[model samples]
Target: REHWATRLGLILAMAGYAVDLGNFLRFPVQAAENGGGAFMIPYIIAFLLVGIPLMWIEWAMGRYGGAQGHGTTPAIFYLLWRNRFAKILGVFGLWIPLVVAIYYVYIESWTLGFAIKFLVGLVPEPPTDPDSILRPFKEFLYSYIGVPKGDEPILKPSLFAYIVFLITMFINVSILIRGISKGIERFAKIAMPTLFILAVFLVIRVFLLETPNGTAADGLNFLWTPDFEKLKDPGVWIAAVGQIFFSLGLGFGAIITFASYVRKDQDIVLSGLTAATLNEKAEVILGGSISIPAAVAFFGVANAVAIAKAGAFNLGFITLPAIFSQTAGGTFLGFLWFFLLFFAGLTSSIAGMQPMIAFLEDELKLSRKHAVLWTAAIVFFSAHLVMFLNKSLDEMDFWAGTIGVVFFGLTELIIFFWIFGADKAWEEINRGGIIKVPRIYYYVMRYITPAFLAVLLVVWAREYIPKIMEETHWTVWITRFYIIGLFLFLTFLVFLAERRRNHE
Candidate 1:
């Protein structure tokens, strides 16, 4: 239903979704923490296996929709299920992005808040006295990580936190209301380049902060450095694949939603690959530059080591801001860094919201404005549970960010690849194409997508069994809460859309 303003615009929006917070920073860090060189084997395997195949599937599905001139859910389920059942399944599809939007807005808010701090030159202060110099940026980060007023003593984002969050989220949603290509696409095009330039600049500053020349080289090797022992563990591959999928906005119905917007002239396979590859590169090359080597060289490899250490919890918040405070011309540079980061975060946040808005207007028959407003209000309320009620912010983050993304991602891919066959899929994918697609795309459609997804799911499940069992009641409870909830919710939507068709 939404026509892209231009090809370049669509690409930028896709890139924004693909290159958000995780890819740029977290993915590299988690990849290293999991297994270095040994880590990449699984990571790369997952990328080729899971990332590419599923990406093509979602892309194909979207193109099919664009061909049909329908919304995400209706297009995806139409061929396979037919009648109202297909629309029912579509509603379930709505859950992926709606949930993503709720949490994504929260993360984007962090970027916005940090950007403001940097721009204002109110960057957090470092320890003034030598005794405290043992710790750097310690005092400043407590505002974020410190326990709140409750007797149970939980660290929660304060009201100020939520206000900043709401404001940034408001800007994000408002942009969507203006139109996708005009607002989202244009913003991404401008921000993506700015993000890269600032990240690279920060990398240079990191190298300068290093005591010796070899520090950055050490960090680079540290990234590629492999621990062979870790290769045996299933978790490494699962984590890597899952990260790739989420980083690329795979499981979240974003691809399906965005793909629906593509013209028939566009090649679904090539476009998906193009977007996915660029995204991975941005994360690997650019994300790696800023978070890994930069952090290691500036903070020292030992200090940059991932730890549960207090204050260090807000690594970027505490360190980067302080770095701005200390550097010779740190003030303006700090502003640019945060401002760019916030801009990057906002671009992706809009992408997440776009899918939900599409489902409401195109599927549920609501006006676009009504759909956007109601959905935003619902999510705003739901997010409060994550922000205020959770006992452990870290624990909430794990469930909301990691477990939630993986579970939803697997569900969406399975539906697209297994339930919706390749032959049926191609009809949609080729709808907008001006030229013919190659035959191999059919093969990628059938065996390649399903096989890769299966491996990824199994590998990831095994890896988490121990951790979930140890920290929580049983691994079963966490698994049940995440997996079961996803299934039921998805099933619920399928049921409703079915009602609409049957009644008609």
Candidate 2:
């Protein structure tokens, strides 16, 4: 019976979850690495082909499940398809976000720590040499986090990052304990609007800057100017699909869990579309504009390219600080930038917990307080393993966060479109619609969405397998076992619940 108190609350909450760390850091990196400006062609196509259709399907399924008082995928799938195997497959929806949240909170906490540091003027000073400034900051930031550079072994626990991680976990648990409407929805109503404001503020500041040599136009041109040759590469298309999938929070079960709380007669079609649109507005218009152009304005295009190559972490934590150091009133702007990320991260991390909370309360009949406590315990213990071991974190992310999401998404689409019947699904979507969904999307949802996902799965596996085989580290093996054990344990819970239901 728990539901959002207002429509705006739900939409803002969805936007908050979708406009996350990826919007701030990952989007710029993806655009730069794939084909600069040329990447948008496939990126937009993937958005249409994969992101929107999947969004509608997830919302429809979630609303249907919510009305029946089933919050997690296992129950939802059983309701939709009435098959045990589908329930088994639906475990992935629970598995991915729970595993991802264990580590993601650690990453999310970094922005908060960095923001506090910036506020206190504790950030590293830029070196006198313009070209070498980013290097010193990189070393300092990595050292603070206890991540080894070059050939160094894994070092001691980063006192700063460790403390911040605890603070982050506390914030997450505190909000989650208040339940959905009072805690998550209330937070989103404030956070999402503030996030947009901060992003636009940063973009405006960056636009007014003049690089020592490179202009903001140079960066803008780099993003918008197409490298059509990249269209020939399969990797470009894959990157686009992955970005759209990741950016929109599709297949993560967060959307489903959130949507499950909607009123049965709510307009899922309009609500889903609006949330997706807001996410893209943040990612493309605000995110894309702020990072690349700011990087070029401060360091020139070549240096920006090197930062992009170094990874999103380096670009955000390392290079961005250096850029701010060189800017007038940079300390203030740096605080805003990192705080904006903190808001984005917190909202997503909170949303990430709902599926697990819903699972516990719905299936096990645990009180909300107990469900959150158990989830908190799991995240705290599991997150420590990743805090010290970078390779382990990467392994977990690739398997659960990346591959697992797509797997669940593909499975759900099949059950919904083929097994449940498209007409029924369409009726579910339009039941309380404020706007008429074009009839063409019915065909798109039926044939194109599943076909596109199958292709994505094949390409993703082809790329992922080689990486999996090549990584021979002991930590990697440990991570694989961790994922396997967690999956089996959660699957057993689903089976146990079904058995209990049958007995009752």
Candidate 3:
């Protein structure tokens, strides 16, 4: 089996995959929404109670599964619980990543598109009227992605975006085909360092700039000012946990798949902590410092708050471009900014694709080349629907990104910590470790993580169910059923593959 060529490579791979646009866009937005500075109180609590424990659990399980010669979650689950049904539930791990990647690649390609255009000075000039920036930005965005305006017929294909998407997929699949150490590890070696450098460079630029209001304090205060009252909102805690879960790439099965490539004697405890710490530094120090504050500095706190409400894409694509336009050497900075986002998204997209490839190779006994080709074929066809159909893409985002992952995390926490027995799990986690995880985390894993996940799941449902229910389009139903069908279909395939292996 393939293994990481160096310890540093493996650590970078984990950090590179975990620290993506979520670190830049999602984390600060979540923090801003959930009581600003006071949010960190719950955020840190959730990181300890849920995030770190979950990371250790996935890494330990992955190495354990790899030792058993399995690369995907189904086989890992079977090993953990010794039940066929356990594999069925573990399907969530595989399905979520694959589904999320389908839509995500499309969104990710936008950064590449914007970056290229900015590099060439082709990005539209910032609107003269500051307040009208979003109107033109939205138009550029919608037209670029082929989203139709009112009564306008579906426009010609976004040939440019499609070209960028193809390039994105090619880069990912090419590296993946080179196998673990030489390909993924090599890329991580480059990507992680480049990502950090770009982050620091832009963060410095953001800090040096003076706002139109002649004060960076408003932006800083908006992000760091503690609003203890806002912490009382249950939604704040839920968002904090969800941000940590999502930003760290938990519950997506990528962590387990990556960890499966580690050498058996390697310590995962410190590695997991290091990766998580790197991700947080990128997230809180850089992510928090850059976009929100910059936006607040340029557009004022009220407008920055509105932009945060507008979603991650809008913040990164629409608002930030406008903000960068007003800065010194704005055009060049815009290019680097989008390029930074492109780098983040590209590394993440590769990570998201690995699990399905591993599944095919491990379960079906396919070669690496064959697995990658098939997985790319599946993603290529499915992603076009997302690329063209906004509703379908949004549906996938909600289910795969928001709902499926949390559910999968909760399930894994229960199975690994409780059903697999915390005593054994803790031993696996601490084995060959540079530093021992505290005994307290064993209890945290056994009780607190699961309970926290349960409450998070409930809070998400209460907040989001009504919003989801309001969308009654037939396309949304098709997207929903499509998710269900895909899950069952893959589960059945894994079941048959497992049975065949037993027979052999």
Candidate 4:
């Protein structure tokens, strides 16, 4: 009954979903830790092998389901395979995205907190001399995020962080509740360009910070220089694929939910390529240029290397904030930097809310407002599990974000190719495309991508599963059980949805 009003709006919304914290924060950190440009080797390989094919797969499947009056995963799976197993298997489609968003919203709040920090001129300053600030500054960063120490029962997100999180929550729900065309699409049309313009300004200013250890050039070179030794490490490969999947929201159901609202005649190939291109430019050029170079120039190449390994959360808040405050016009510079991130985060978070709303609206027959409210309530309460509990977010990220999506992505490919039938699936992908999918991808999707994902899961399981078992932490166990509860609950809803439709 509802569809996009314009092609540009749809493309912008999809691009907004794809270009997220994964681009600006996660990509830089992964690149830094995994041997700089060598990371790009596997990154490029996965993008081609796993990313593009799956992008088309999700978009085509989404539109196909939409045409059949099903807009969410559980129903969409049931539609494709005509069985409850298909529906139940697709429960990951709902649960994974939900868990990702909960912690994601918690993370997104930090951007707003930093933005407020910059505007208020309360940001910390770092030593201009070439060395790492990680030692002393981490405490401030920890304090801002309310990091609990020594097995504290409840601590995290200082009052500022918590209030900002609530504000972030409010903005997402307010925008989402306005419906697609007026809220998600309309805001993106404006926000995407604004974000690009702000990033352009930041990049130019970063390049202006002249000569520190022969300057930003060193940073740029370090960023793009290849380190072939990392290619031997399997962690690098998994990280590359993880960045790809996280960046694209592949197998996470947000893209599928967005695509489900598309008109059948819309060009999936052109749209898919264009949306991904938007993300790549923002990620590779904008994300890489601004953060990595600034860190290298400010912290020195050696320090930047260490900072990167410390992870994006520390860099984004601790390092970037310090660099911004030390710069001229830094008040506004810091404001725009974090505010720009808030823009990206809000759009992506808005997109994340939909799959479940679609589930409630389509499967349970709730009105749009009621569905939004119920989903918001579920997420807000669920987010507290991440907020107060130590290591909850990390556990959720490992299980739901990394492991779950990798497995779910592979599972979806199996359903699409094997159960949906390869020929039919290929036909569906090309059904309304302006450009025909190359014949090579027929083999790529059917055989190559699935094989790659399978090998990845096996290798990844062999490597990490043992380490995971060694962790006897109570919070991790709570996190694991919570996810299990979440999954079984979604599975129950899948069956309940079918029963409701049958009874009606």
Candidate 5:
């Protein structure tokens, strides 16, 4: 029923969708922890082998599906193959993005909250408490998000926090209601360049800092210098591959939804490659240049290394703000930093909702306005639950953010290359391509990519699953069931959709 209004708009929306918070926060931390430059070897290798192919596959599959009057993954699967089982398998595509979007919008709201506070000069200076380097920042974060500890009455969020969250939610809803081109593409056109300018100022501040403890140049050295021996460890390779999957926006179904709007003759080969290149530069270049280096210069190298090892939230939320406060006129810079994050998070959240939006409209026959309203109502309740419920987000992220992509990536491959046939898949990819993809990739797509995904599934099964299973907390169980319940509900909805389709 809809299509991308322009090529430039499609590219910006896709790249903006790709330039997520992980690009700034997660990638640098992964690099620092994994032996820096050596991690790049496996990262780039996997990106070429699996990442690019996945992008093309999703894009081709999407445009193909859209042309057949099917926009949802489940419907598309049915369109691709005759079996009922194949359509059911695509339930993951709808569930994964919708679940992630719930918590993702909540997290993005925190950035907006922080940004507004910084802009109005409400951010307090570092407290003299010496318990931890991040103590003051930690307290501030807890207060804003409502961390219900021993005595704080069943974990209540502040009215301010709730209001800000509502604002962020509507921002996403507003854009979604406008449809794809005018909504997502228009926002990306403005948001991407705005974030880049904001980031430029922050990066310049990082480079100019001559901290008594360490230097940005030294931090860059640590980031780029390889410990050759570290590459041999299997965990480094796993981490590198996992990060690429996480960063590329593959398997979330947004890329497929985005590409569906692209014209069949628009040369998808370069389109996928261009969006990917933009994402890579954002992750490696801008993402690398900022957080870790800034942390090193402001804190000592020892502290910076520890910060990176601690993972993304602390690095972005606590430590970076601590660094910002120590500098002259940092309140504005602090706003820029958080504003940049808000923009990043905002772009990603909207794209996340798109997969589900297409499903409701195309599969269930809802009008676009009603679909937007209904998704908002459902996500609103879910997001509130995640915000109020302790430990829910962490457990949800493990299933949705971590394990979900690997599973979806694997199955989508089977549907396209193995079931649909590779020769046809190759021709679909090259159809209307500006430059033909090298023939060698056909072999990689058919053989190597699926093999790598299978290996990843095995690794997670043997390693990650047991660790996740060891958690015996009540809330963890509750969260797990919530996801299961959502799946059941979606399955029921699909039953309705299928019945409606068959009747017609």
Candidate 6:
């Protein structure tokens, strides 16, 4: 019964969700790791060609779908093909969140553990003297990280930690089920601003270090500065686009589904632009200045380079904690930074869970409370399966990162813009909103966007395309078929379910 009470709330919620954990912790280091300022080249290319167009398309589809009273995949896909392709997508959208939520909770659990320890006095103070600090700190971390499997450890996950994690997750779900205006919008309004403030503050603090190479002369050189050669790297380009699409919460119909909750008069065009631009800026400008330089500055760039090469962990888990430990207000500021990141993560994750819940609540007519419970339960379990089975970041990165975004995004775009016709989507984008879309959106949506996607597909394909064929080589086509086969199976399940409904 509830909807976005104002355009402001919708914009905040959608944009807030768009710029979550990946934006804050992941992108800064990603930029640095990829080639600093040169990273911006591909980042900008991806944003202009892929990111913005996709955001608008998703928003337009969501607004139209909402007005039409369709939820998730059904809303966008039903508009195009009557063959149940749309319904299948709705189911897929639901499953994706459930898959993500499982491991997402596990990751969130790490923060909860840290936050709790910091709140209590359980976190031991670092040695006061520089010599003691340097020696004892490394010893402590080495011992802590190297704990034996059977040894009882204070910092490791416990029964109490699991309970708190589950309780916190439940509370989050309760807020979301109250509807967008009350829960999602309200949370986004408060959380997004707080996150932005914290990120900027962290950036300013990190930039004060003295780099031996005069890196800080320009201030935060680790993040802002670039290598022009890496800018031209194709891998960087693909990753940037993938990150944008993932960060923006498009392709999965979350935005489109969320937009459905907004009123017809909401100015989504401006909102979409603001969301894409601000989200990227927060990551590139603010997060970059803070995370990258701070890590390299405090410990020296050589140490940062070593840790990064070790495949130690994620940018957030690996980089921030150690960097904070080396700083002046290491304990205090560290808490604030991670807490802000945790809040950002929670808000985005809550939004991530909604599309599937919408399908359950709106399409299947499940009671909202029951739908919410069931949806969370599924995601909670599914995520662990992915981690346990694959157990590698590279696997997680490929399955969840590249494949998920490109596959879902491409499918949704083809269905909405091409299959449903760009004219219909254009009308929807202009409808219930006052912002004037560019006259060239038609050309962009039709030719430019699709062409870019086609090129990306080739690039994606060529990465494993054997430059020098060898008998022992695992052909890229073999891998492609496996991926495509899995996608087809999932698609078939959706098709069968929708067919049973007889194209309702």
Against the unseen true structure, what C-alpha lDDT does each candidate score?
0.64, 0.87, 0.85, 0.83, 0.85, 0.64
Model 6: residue 454 alpha-carbon error in angstroms: 3.3
Model 4 error, position 257 (Å): 1.0
lDDT per residue as tens, model 6, 1-504: 448877677777877777766776677656766787787777787787788888888887777667666667754576667765566665555555544555666566556555565555345455433344344434443333332344332123345555656766776787777767788888888888888888777766666656453333343655566678886677777777766666667665577678777666567788889877778777777766766566566555556655345432344654556555665767777677667767777877788788777776666667778877877776665544333332322343455445555667777778877888788878877765567788877788777777777667667656632432332223333333443454565466445545555767
lDDT of 3 by residue, 198-259 (tens): 88898888887786564456777888988899878877888788888888888899999999
Estimate candidate 5's RMSD in Å: 1.5
Comparing 4 and 6 on lDDT, the stronger one: 4
Per-residue error at 103 for model 6, in Å?
1.4
Candidate 5 or 4, higher TM-score: 5
TM-score of each: 0.83, 0.96, 0.96, 0.95, 0.97, 0.83
Compare candidates 2 and 4 on lDDT and give the better one. 2
**Top-TM-score candidate index:** 5
lDDT of 1 by residue, 202-223 (tens): 7676556554423666677677
- Candidate 3 vs candidate 4: the TM-score winner is 3
Name the runs in model 3 displaced over 4 angstroms.
151-157
Point out where model 2 deviates above 4 Å.
128-131, 149-155
Better of 1 and 2 by TM-score: 2
Report the lDDT tens digits of candidate 4 across residue range 211-270.
Answer: 445467777888888899999998888878767877888888888888888987778888
Report how far off residue 364 is in candidate 6 (Å).
Answer: 1.3
Identify the runs in model 5 with alpha carbons over 4 angstroms from their true place.
127-133, 151-154
Measured on C-alpha atoms, candidate 5 has an lDDT of: 0.85
| lDDT, residue 130, model 5 | 27
Worst 10 residues of 6 by lDDT: 385-394
